Scaffold this motif. Structure first.
Motif, PDB file in Angstrom:
ATOM      1  N   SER A  49       0.816  -1.211   0.000  1.00 18.96           N
ATOM      2  CA  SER A  49       0.000   0.000   0.000  1.00 18.96           C
ATOM      3  C   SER A  49       0.851   1.263   0.000  1.00 18.96           C
ATOM      4  O   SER A  49       0.455   2.268  -0.606  1.00 18.96           O
ATOM      5  CB  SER A  49      -0.938  -0.004   1.207  1.00 18.96           C
ATOM      6  N   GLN A  56       3.013   5.546  -5.950  1.00 16.43           N
ATOM      7  CA  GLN A  56       2.829   5.619  -7.398  1.00 16.43           C
ATOM      8  C   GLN A  56       1.637   6.492  -7.763  1.00 16.43           C
ATOM      9  O   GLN A  56       1.688   7.259  -8.734  1.00 16.43           O
ATOM     10  CB  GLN A  56       2.645   4.209  -7.958  1.00 16.43           C
ATOM     11  N   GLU A  57       0.580   6.417  -6.960  1.00 19.72           N
ATOM     12  CA  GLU A  57      -0.619   7.208  -7.208  1.00 19.72           C
ATOM     13  C   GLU A  57      -0.322   8.706  -7.018  1.00 19.72           C
ATOM     14  O   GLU A  57      -0.772   9.542  -7.820  1.00 19.72           O
ATOM     15  CB  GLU A  57      -1.747   6.645  -6.334  1.00 19.72           C
ATOM     16  N   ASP A  58       0.477   9.074  -5.995  1.00 15.02           N
ATOM     17  CA  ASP A  58       0.761  10.504  -5.852  1.00 15.02           C
ATOM     18  C   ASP A  58       1.830  10.982  -6.833  1.00 15.02           C
ATOM     19  O   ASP A  58       1.870  12.179  -7.132  1.00 15.02           O
ATOM     20  CB  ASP A  58       1.157  10.898  -4.413  1.00 15.02           C
ATOM     21  N   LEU A 112       1.507   9.937  -9.883  1.00 11.17           N
ATOM     22  CA  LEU A 112       0.588  10.222 -10.978  1.00 11.17           C
ATOM     23  C   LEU A 112      -0.075  11.580 -10.787  1.00 11.17           C
ATOM     24  O   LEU A 112      -0.359  12.249 -11.788  1.00 11.17           O
ATOM     25  CB  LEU A 112      -0.470   9.127 -11.115  1.00 11.17           C
ATOM     26  N   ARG A 113      -0.357  12.010  -9.545  1.00  6.65           N
ATOM     27  CA  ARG A 113      -1.078  13.282  -9.481  1.00  6.65           C
ATOM     28  C   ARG A 113      -0.159  14.481  -9.728  1.00  6.65           C
ATOM     29  O   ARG A 113      -0.672  15.586  -9.932  1.00  6.65           O
ATOM     30  CB  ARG A 113      -1.812  13.640  -8.177  1.00  6.65           C
ATOM     31  N   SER A 124       2.120   1.615  -3.580  1.00  9.69           N
ATOM     32  CA  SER A 124       1.003   1.854  -4.490  1.00  9.69           C
ATOM     33  C   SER A 124       0.472   3.276  -4.361  1.00  9.69           C
ATOM     34  O   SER A 124       0.236   3.952  -5.373  1.00  9.69           O
ATOM     35  CB  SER A 124      -0.112   0.840  -4.232  1.00  9.69           C
ATOM     36  N   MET A 125       0.328   3.773  -3.133  1.00 13.60           N
ATOM     37  CA  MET A 125      -0.117   5.146  -2.969  1.00 13.60           C
ATOM     38  C   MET A 125       0.992   6.130  -3.301  1.00 13.60           C
ATOM     39  O   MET A 125       0.697   7.247  -3.741  1.00 13.60           O
ATOM     40  CB  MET A 125      -0.584   5.323  -1.521  1.00 13.60           C
ATOM     41  N   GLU A 151       0.195   4.655 -18.381  1.00 10.69           N
ATOM     42  CA  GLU A 151       1.076   5.334 -17.437  1.00 10.69           C
ATOM     43  C   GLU A 151       2.511   4.814 -17.431  1.00 10.69           C
ATOM     44  O   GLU A 151       3.411   5.526 -16.955  1.00 10.69           O
ATOM     45  CB  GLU A 151       0.488   5.208 -16.033  1.00 10.69           C
TER      46      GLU A 151
END
Lengths: 427, 598, 61
Positions: free
Chosen positions: B163, B169-171, B173-174, B166-167, B230
């Motif tokens: 997690s 990688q998500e931030d 992306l933002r 993964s989060m 991505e």
């Protein structure tokens, strides 16, 4: 067909190539193509001063060194380096220069070869370095060369300008990362020069400018582990031979263990080699300079070096697990460490016992598996033959029983004597 | 500079707690890289007296210093001779600014205040030294932040790593600045003698640190990730590092081992569609620096490990990526010498043929198991050592599956680049050792290539059907004519090269008993005639296809060398003579059509 | 129970072939996904390469 690399016809071809080489250009791709074609002939050939008795090969190396400091494109530089290798080893010009040309060999090394190769070693075009390194290692395998390299790294590293320190740590990094293991194990002062280069490299980790400190730390990451093992073996050889410099080297080695711990900077075979080396330094009753500017006999002093090694050993077993029982290797090594740790440490006016009490508390606090494995030999030697060391003594006996199943017979009984010692050594 | 070990010696940390407690201090981006705090939207310029006022100006996401330089040049009417003699700076922090860097990495959004800006008169050399030293200091703090992020995600608990990454990688992306700020350098300062090897050494360290961070970010995550578009954006940093420092050996060993690691990890994506994002840049860098053997050795080792991992889809994607950069001397598409050569592709394939020894020791930075085996059982432990005829066999199979598609046309361009170079280097190696087993392997190799050419011509009948505000019409005539002229070019270069050479090789084989082995059969000749007849059926209406080199090389080089002393091959000739009959009858009976013919 | 049997991998074969030449092993899912869609050393070609890779990175989002 064989035609002879030393024959008078071939040297006449070489004389043609010299007076091509001595004529400069003053388009540019024409000079790249002309020198490469001449170089291909050179590949195919071998698989005012008093210059009129000189052979033309060293004068070719002379004009190569002369025109080395003119251009800035690495293509012609690369080609020149190829030619240089063809002449130095396959042409054997440095081999005959060290055979029967010492003075002119001193002329060659003293001002041309070392300073030019120190100029071309770079950290942005790393194919010139890949060509330059075995030539420079061939240069430092000869007398008079290590002094010049010593003064070069002294004036580069100890400079008052930090950019010289910067450029010195990048260049010594590029020599270190293009080195081999078994190619160095025959020459003494080659190992000494590489050891001084490596110790200045380790010394730059703690420099006063933060940029050189962070650069040495991050550039230590980008070194292949066989080269670091060979450097550690050279440093261990220089620790073995040279006597008066054992204060500094251990500090450097502690920094090495603190930074690059995946390579065995400290291991049990390392300690058994140093155990036999302190035995040959203790139970037996040079010409090189001291590398202390890199940073800047039978009763006490060798025993104090032994004590210092004990403190480094306690730091080692406190730091890492070092499971010598997980493999069948290093069983005799760790066994030799415990045996001789019993024998030479077992005579109540020494400096080893208080440091052993000072260390074993953090050992038992941080390690558990080897800690339990070594406990009974710690308590066998506690009183085998004082305020603050009493404080660490009771701290030791505090962490003997906190998580440890000690419970045996004929040994626990001495703890009764221990509370007798609560009314004996206090009384 | 000491927190890099403190975070290695402090446990109990996650991604969210520092973000939740940092937002209270209004300085989130000043510690870690992945803090998504937006920046300012307006900025104020200050004057020097009562003649001018501090003026507010908007800031977009693409605003830079040069637009403000044009603003102060236009407003204050500064002469352009004194352009470099003037600079802009802040009064409060006393900071000079680099010209070619973005404002948004430097000014986060202050709470209803805007930082100041003053147009100042300064000597240029002191200003450029100040710029060089402040950006030396500044990207040393970026390098420090990257050290904090790399040391942060190493000793995390083994339950919470998934997690976390993964989060993470998500931030990433933002962030709108990723990966601009992660790959761009400072180029108006690399050429000076006073920022020569300082900015290079720190840039090499910064790129190596970014590669380490990405490699940790790719690993950890699950192997069955829904990888959309991505991945290409993330891969672009890996391309960009090899763009900036290709001959630096550290970045090369790290780049090779990181792409090997991320090709072993995401095995699903890198078996179907994954190699299309990393191979264009690797081929361009391989093609340009041909006078640099270390870069060459590193890329051949990396491509050999690519093939050892994935055998046939890698070769397919490789041919799909070397294709849009290939230029060949055709008389229809005049290919210039400003891209990937045909030789560069063919010697890369020849290095893929043989074994590559390791000199740079790139394998011990690979985290997977060693030695590498095939990650799928469809190819298994069969002895599929990479030959070069099988590349032709793959190209035949993909053009044969659907010859009207786009991959067929693309691989026809691939084939007309490859098979003349293969026949050429085959000619060199058979004219190099001059031995009887060399003659035997040359006859067998020509026979097997001939077999693959018969297989190529047997399955292109969909191209024998003829054709049916003008730009889509030119596209339709293009995609009409490209595979047809590709087949004619391949077949006539094959015939005029190897036919007399087949007689020459038969003379020097040591056995002249076998002669005239009949390379092409009657159906292949009739198929070539029907394709050429379908090409000539469009000829008078569009004037650009008369001069096409496939058709002209067939007419002037393949018709007279075709034997017709037997009459089994003759219906090809009657169709060719019939088409030329009707074309010149139509060119004669219509004078308007004659008025526009070359 | 549903994996004890030996695995069966789907292939690609075409019948309009002279049958003296073997069609190689390629899975059909990959096949349909695929068929569906000295001068370099200077400091100017790298910067132009960087700005070309940045516009092409931004264009594919």
């Amino acid at each position: 067909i064989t035609m002879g690399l030393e024959h008078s016809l071939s040297k006449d071809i070489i004389s043609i190539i010299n007076n091509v080489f001595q004529a400069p250009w003053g388009l540019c791709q024409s000079s790249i193509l002309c020198y490469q074609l001449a170089c291909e002939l050179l590949e195919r050939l071998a698989p005012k001063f008093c210059y009129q008795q000189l052979p033309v090969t060293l004068r070719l190396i002379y004009t190569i060194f002369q025109e080395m400091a003119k251009f800035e494109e690495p293509d012609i530089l690369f080609n020149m380096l190829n030619c240089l290798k063809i002449l130095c080893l396959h042409g054997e010009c440095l081999y005959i220069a060290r055979k029967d040309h010492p003075q002119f060999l001193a002329y060659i090394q003293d001002h041309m070869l070392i300073a030019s190769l120190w100029r071309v070693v770079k950290s942005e075009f790393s194919q010139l370095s890949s060509l330059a390194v075995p030539l420079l290692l061939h240069a430092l395998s000869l007398p008079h060369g290590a002094d010049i390299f010593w003064t070069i790294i002294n004036g580069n590293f100890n400079s008052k300008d930090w950019k010289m320190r910067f450029e010195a740590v990048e260049k010594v990094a590029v020599i270190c990362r293009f080195l081999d293991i078994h190619s160095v194990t025959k020459n003494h002062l080659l190992k000494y020069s590489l050891a001084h280069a490596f110790c200045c490299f380790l010394t730059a980790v703690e420099d006063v400018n933060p940029a050189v400190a962070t650069r040495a730390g991050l550039l230590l990451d980008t070194i292949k582990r066989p080269a670091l093992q060979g450097l550690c073996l050279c440093l261990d050889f220089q620790f073995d031979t040279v006597v008066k410099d054992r204060p500094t080297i251990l500090s450097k080695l502690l920094l090495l263990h603190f930074l690059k711990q995946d390579i065995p900077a400290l291991s049990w075979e390392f300690f058994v080699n140093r155990f036999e080396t302190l035995s040959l330094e203790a139970q037996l009753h040079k010409s090189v300079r001291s590398l202390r500017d890199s940073v800047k006999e039978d009763a006490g002093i060798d025993h104090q070096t032994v004590h210092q090694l004990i403190t480094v050993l306690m730091k080692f077993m406190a730091k890492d697990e070092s499971s010598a029982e997980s493999d069948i290797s290093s069983a005799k090594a760790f066994n030799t460490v415990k045996r001789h740790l019993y024998v030479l440490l077992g005579m109540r006016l020494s400096t080893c016992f208080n440091a052993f009490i000072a260390g074993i508390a953090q050992v038992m606090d941080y390690n558990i598996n080897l800690g339990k494995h070594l406990l009974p030999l710690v308590v066998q030697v506690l009183k085998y033959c004082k305020p603050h060391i009493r404080q660490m003594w009771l701290k030791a006996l505090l962490v003997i029983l906190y998580k440890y199943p000690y419970r045996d017979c004929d040994i626990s009984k001495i703890l009764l004597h221990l509370i007798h010692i609560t009314v004996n050594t206090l009384n | 500079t000491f927190l890099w070990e403190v975070v290695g010696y402090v446990e109990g940390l996650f991604f969210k707690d520092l973000k939740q407690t940092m937002k209270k201090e209004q300085c989130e981006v000043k510690l870690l890289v992945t803090a998504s705090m937006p920046g300012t939207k307006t900025l104020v310029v200050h004057g020097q007296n009562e003649c001018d006022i501090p003026t507010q100006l908007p800031v977009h996401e693409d605003t830079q210093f040069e637009a403000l330089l044009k603003e102060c040049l236009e407003f204050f009417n500064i002469p352009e001779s004194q352009s470099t003699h003037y600079f802009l700076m802040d009064k409060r922090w006393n900071l000079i600014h680099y010209n070619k860097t973005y404002v948004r990495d430097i000014y986060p959004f202050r709470r209803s205040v805007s930082p100041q800006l003053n147009l100042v008169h300064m000597h240029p050399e002191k200003g450029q030294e100040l710029i060089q030293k402040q950006v030396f200091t500044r990207k040393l703090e970026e390098v420090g932040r990257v050290l904090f992020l790399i040391s942060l995600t190493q000793k995390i608990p083994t339950a919470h790593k998934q997690s976390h990454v993964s989060m993470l990688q998500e931030d990433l992306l933002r962030l709108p600045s990723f990966p601009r700020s992660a790959i761009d350098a400072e180029f108006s300062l690399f050429s000076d003698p006073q920022a020569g090897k300082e900015l290079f050494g720190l840039d090499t360290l910064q790129k190596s640190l970014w590669i380490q961070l990405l490699e940790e970010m790719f690993l950890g995550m699950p192997s069955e990730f829904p990888w959309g578009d991505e991945i290409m954006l993330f891969l672009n940093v890996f391309n960009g590092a090899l763009i900036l420092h290709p001959e630096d050996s550290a970045l090369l060993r790290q780049y090779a081992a990181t792409v090997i690691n991320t090709a072993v990890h995401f095995n699903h994506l890198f078996s179907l569609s994954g190699y299309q994002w990393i191979l264009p840049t690797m081929l361009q860098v391989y093609s340009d620096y041909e006078s640099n053997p270390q870069l060459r050795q590193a890329i051949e080792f990396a491509c050999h490990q690519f093939y050892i991992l994935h055998r046939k889809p890698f070769v397919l994607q490789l041919f799909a990526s070397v294709a849009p950069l290939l230029e060949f001397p055709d008389a229809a598409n005049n290919g210039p010498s400003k891209g990937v050569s045909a030789q560069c592709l063919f010697d890369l394939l020849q290095s893929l043929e043989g074994e590559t020894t390791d000199i740079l020791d790139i394998l011990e930075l690979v985290k997977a198991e060693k030695p590498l085996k095939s990650l799928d059982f469809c190819y298994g432990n069969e002895d599929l050592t990479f030959s070069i005829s099988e590349a032709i066999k793959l190209c035949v199979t993909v053009v044969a599956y659907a010859p009207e598609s786009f991959r067929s046309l693309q691989m026809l361009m691939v084939l007309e680049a490859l098979v003349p170079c293969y026949l050429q280097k085959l000619k060199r190696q058979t004219s190099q050792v001059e031995t009887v087993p060399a003659a035997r392997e040359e006859i067998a190799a020509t026979a097997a290539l001939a077999t693959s050419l018969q297989a190529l011509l047997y399955s292109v009948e969909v191209l024998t059907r003829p054709m049916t505000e003008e730009l889509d019409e030119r596209i339709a005539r293009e995609e009409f004519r490209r595979p047809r002229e590709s087949l004619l070019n391949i077949c006539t270069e094959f015939y005029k090269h190897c036919g007399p050479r087949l007689k020459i090789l038969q003379n020097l084989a040591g056995e002249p008993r076998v002669i005239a082995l009949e390379l092409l059969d009657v159906k292949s000749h009739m198929r070539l005639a029907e394709i050429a007849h379908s090409l000539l059926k469009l000829a008078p209406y569009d004037t650009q296809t008369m001069e096409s080199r496939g058709l002209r090389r067939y007419i002037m080089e393949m018709l007279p060398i075709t034997d017709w002393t037997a009459e089994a091959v003759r219906p090809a000739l009657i169709l060719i003579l019939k088409r030329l009959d009707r074309m010149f009858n139509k060119i004669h009976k219509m004078p308007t059509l004659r008025r526009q013919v070359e | 129970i549903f994996e004890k049997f030996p695995n069966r991998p789907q292939m690609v074969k075409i019948s309009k072939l002279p049958s003296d030449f073997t069609v190689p092993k390629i899975r059909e899912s990959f096949m349909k996904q695929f068929i569906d869609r000295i001068r370099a050393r200077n400091l100017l070609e790298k910067e132009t390469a960087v700005t070309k890779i940045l516009r092409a990175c931004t264009r594919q989002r």
